[PDB]
Amino acid sequence: FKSELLAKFVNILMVDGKKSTAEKIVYTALDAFEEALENVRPAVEVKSRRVGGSTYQVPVEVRPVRRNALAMRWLVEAARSMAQRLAAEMLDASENKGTAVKKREDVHRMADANKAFAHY
């Protein structure tokens, strides 16, 4: 397909050096992305600081690169045959359903709940 994000996705899917097994899986279930990714990409995430003497979950922006990377990770981790689990997720991911979308949600939820720490 000749796309660096696709390269990433398989390497994020790849296990134990096995690029072929991965590459097949992704390529086959793709036969059955750029959208379904963009509906998992999180804009906001909580981090954590030693604030002085406690641990507070502080909202921060996700930068666009980590945005695509966190999405891929979430798809794969939810998704985890595999091609009969990697289109399964990565279609519900275009239909704002599943667990990769639940991530985007439950992350934004946590950030929304921590807006009181946004900039301090």
Partner RNA sequence: UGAAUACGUUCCCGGGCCUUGUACACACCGCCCGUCACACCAUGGGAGUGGGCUGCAAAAGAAGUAGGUAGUUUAACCUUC
Q: Is 1 in the site for RNA (CB under 7 A)?
A: no
Whether residue 57 contacts residue 114, with contact meaning beta carbons closer than 8 Å, is answered with yes
Give the range of 64-72, 76-84, 85-93, 101-109 binding RNA by CB under 7 A. Answer: 64-72
Q: Is 83 in the site for RNA (CB under 7 A)?
A: no
Please give the biggest Cα pair distance in the chain: 52
- For residue 44, count CB atoms less than 10 angstroms from its CB and return exposed for 0-12, middle for 13-18, buried for 19 or more: middle
Q: Is 110 in the site for RNA (CB under 7 A)?
A: no
CA 71 to each of CA 36, 64, 103, 119: distance values in angstroms, whole numbers, following the listed order? 9, 11, 9, 25
Tokens of 73: 């990770």
Q: How far is the CB of 11 from RNA (least distance, A)?
A: 3
Of 8 and 95, which CB lies nearer to RNA in the complex structure?
A: 8
Give the range of 10-18, 33-41, 97-105, 112-120 binding RNA by CB under 7 A. Answer: 10-18
Query: Footprint of RNA on this chain (CB under 7 A)?
Result: 7-8, 11-12, 14, 16-20, 49-50, 65-66, 69
